[PDB]
C-alpha atoms as one frame of an Amber mdcrd trajectory, in Angstrom:
protein
  -0.303  -0.469   0.223   2.684   2.306  -0.489   5.263   0.632  -2.912   5.602
   2.805  -6.110   3.395   0.264  -7.654   0.590   0.909  -4.320   0.193   4.813
  -5.978   0.240   4.700  -9.226  -2.312   1.869  -9.201  -4.495   4.003  -7.688
  -3.577   7.264 -10.126  -3.709   5.089 -13.336  -7.690   3.963 -12.087  -8.614
   7.583 -11.792  -7.267   8.982 -14.899  -8.716   5.766 -16.488 -12.478   5.839
 -14.997 -12.061   9.463 -16.809 -10.336   8.174 -19.769  -6.645  10.241 -19.053
  -3.585   8.720 -19.879  -1.024   7.267 -17.726   2.045   8.645 -15.455   5.360
   6.863 -14.744   7.490   6.264 -11.856  10.546   8.890 -11.676  11.991   7.735
  -8.779  13.913  10.129  -8.238  10.447  12.570  -7.942  10.031   9.262  -5.449
  12.983  10.419  -3.363  12.581  14.020  -3.852   9.177  13.738  -2.439   9.780
  11.029   0.323  13.140  13.650   1.379  10.708  16.650   1.338   7.823  15.084
   3.462  10.732  13.394   5.613  12.135  16.946   6.616   8.323  18.601   6.328
   7.381  15.622   8.703   8.836  17.558  11.587   6.116  20.008  11.355   3.390
  17.373   9.631   1.841  20.441   7.865   0.015  19.818   4.080   2.567  22.749
   3.056   4.241  22.216  -0.738   4.809  23.903  -3.843   0.597  24.211  -4.072
  -0.048  23.806  -7.958   2.116  20.055  -8.890   1.457  18.251  -5.865  -1.008
  16.546  -3.239  -0.317  16.160   0.157  -2.041  14.209   2.934  -1.537  13.704
   6.427  -3.591  10.482   8.304  -3.765   9.495  11.640  -1.902   5.831  12.669
  -2.420   2.744   9.736  -2.368   5.819   7.099  -1.005   4.148   3.674   0.403
   5.691   0.057  -2.521   3.705  -1.726  -5.111   4.941   1.308  -4.001   8.271
   0.282  -4.234   8.647  -3.132  -7.678   6.910  -2.349  -8.526   9.752  -0.003
  -8.326  12.087  -2.925 -10.487   9.863  -4.931 -12.699  10.242  -1.801 -13.545
  13.260  -4.130 -15.041  10.976  -6.643 -18.813  12.357  -7.415 -17.256  15.676
  -6.602 -15.718  14.802 -10.319 -18.756  14.867 -13.244 -16.717  13.616 -16.447
 -20.562  13.991 -17.951 -20.461  17.762 -17.640 -15.988  17.396 -17.699 -15.582
  20.076 -14.474 -15.673  20.547 -11.004 -19.521  19.808  -9.607 -20.786  22.338
  -7.804 -19.724  20.441  -4.580 -17.204  21.549  -2.320 -13.750  19.974  -2.244
 -12.448  19.117  -5.640  -8.934  19.847  -4.936  -6.994  16.402  -5.399  -8.788
  14.964  -7.348  -8.249  17.300 -10.188  -4.439  16.940  -9.658  -4.242  13.376
  -9.339  -5.901  13.170 -13.141  -4.141  15.997 -13.936  -3.514  15.029 -18.134
  -1.242  17.351 -18.326   2.171  15.220 -15.694   3.475  12.526 -16.905   5.945
  12.572 -15.100   4.850  11.165 -11.250   6.737  10.012  -7.815   5.176   9.943
  -4.372   6.632   9.437  -0.529   5.186   8.588   3.156   7.145  10.346   5.785
   6.153  10.021   9.614   5.312  12.675  11.584   6.378  14.795  14.123   2.892
  13.976  16.031   2.731   9.680  15.602   0.834  10.927  12.175   1.702   9.848
   8.876   2.449  12.483   6.518   2.519  11.516   2.458   3.524  13.840  -0.619
   3.104  13.423  -4.438   5.409  15.517  -6.909   4.162  16.282 -10.040   5.158
  18.305 -13.220   4.226  19.901 -15.194   2.500  21.572 -12.319  -0.528  20.413
 -11.568  -4.251  21.300 -10.268  -3.545  24.921 -11.918  -5.836  27.001 -13.782
  -3.534  27.478 -17.170  -5.152  24.652 -18.826  -8.004  21.684 -18.558  -7.180
  18.920 -15.495  -9.606  16.220 -17.327
């Protein structure tokens, strides 16, 4: 639930569900993501860049798979039938996961200085960005 494929699988699912192209594991992005998470875990705050990442903090058994899944929890807040976010709050996560523009992927899990687990997932080109279309 934290291996490269664990993150990738869920992303690739969500993307597949709206017929968006895949992504790959850059490995170095994964180091970067985990290393950023590892440092920033001394705080724990959902603070990384803004547009081109997907951050998560959980509580205990919080896995990377679960984190991507938490982002896909906004499933019915996306609606490909209208090809936009629904008039429903919190659609600022799935959008990135599904971000057509990003072809790189790499993610990392680090344990916070409060018991909980931090997760980061980097993407380039930038994502969840106004400019081009998410899906």
